[PDB]
Amino acid sequence: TGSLAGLQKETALSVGAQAGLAWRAKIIDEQLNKQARNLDAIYDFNSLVLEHNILPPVLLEGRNTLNLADAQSIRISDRTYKVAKQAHFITTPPTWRQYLWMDYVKPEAPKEIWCIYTERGWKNGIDQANTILEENIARIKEDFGGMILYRKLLAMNMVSPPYVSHTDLGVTGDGSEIHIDDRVLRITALPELNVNSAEWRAAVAK
């Protein structure tokens, strides 16, 4: 090998990864708990809820789209809009702890070349935990941005609002059980994009 004149263990990585993942998860949980009020101020799901306690839908946007289907034919588009999730009734608003909180369980289940490979696994577990936290941040950012995009398109008159019908009943029931004021609420029209471009409203900001 080299020139002509020049020609003429694996368990340490596993235990280092399994320790470093939990250690980095605990430090990430502590850093998340240090900034609890700022996260509530930033990801305010409560004030985006509609009139009848309905969570707004999630919209996705794409710009300047090209597809090469095969030879001799291509398809291009200027903008595209998609409805990723649909509106529904809720009783509680979402919180950032369902998205960002990482899982910690303390592991109590345990020399010439041992230390370097233990160190390499120790860095690998930290990298894995950072990747998991990055994916969680991307997910919560996607959901919040979709709700903001729906609130913008409602003012821009491209989506339809949901429609709520309520039926009022009087004093119902038999002689063994009564209910005083029954009210049944049902949404009849889901939000949807419109294709009538002549009814859209533009916005010019001075």
Binding site: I42, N46, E51, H52, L133, A155, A205
Partner: protein
């Protein structure tokens, strides 16, 4: 010796990633609020519904993350006003989140009234010294 002025404490990459997400959230909200303000210009202010008077100028710093009624009752009791509730409270509670520092009770009541939105309203009668919370005619 060569130095540059801002030398702070060492930072964490989790906080770096959270800040990078928060900047994009913030200017998305800025663009959407600008578009919303351009489309719908408001014409009325709640100064008429909530006016100020004497002993509404005592100040408060509040960090509250619960329902509206107990906080409004505490503000009224500190302002030495009677408290009145109109309408039926909904089964799903009306939640508010206030985090301010050293502002007047009239401004506190106005921010609570604005954050309540379409669910509840705040009225102040200074001649009778009454703070009133009314629930919406919905459900």
């Amino acid at each position: 010796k060569f130095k540059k002025p801002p030398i702070n404490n060492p930072s964490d990459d989790a906080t770096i990633k959270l800040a990078e997400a928060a900047v994009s959230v913030s200017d998305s909200m800025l663009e959407m609020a600008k578009v919303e303000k351009v489309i719908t210009p408001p014409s009325k202010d709640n100064t008429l519904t909530i006016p100020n008077a004497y002993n509404l100028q005592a100040r408060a710093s509040v960090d509250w993350s619960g329902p509206i009624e107990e906080l409004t009752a505490r503000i009224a009791k500190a302002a030495h006003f009677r408290f009145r509730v109109l309408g039926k409270s909904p089964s799903v509670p009306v939640l508010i989140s206030i985090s301010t520092k050293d502002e007047s009770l009239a401004e506190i009541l106005r921010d609570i009234d604005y954050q309540a939105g379409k669910k509840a309203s705040i009225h102040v009668y200074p001649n009778s010294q009454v703070v009133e919370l009314r629930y919406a005619k919905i459900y």
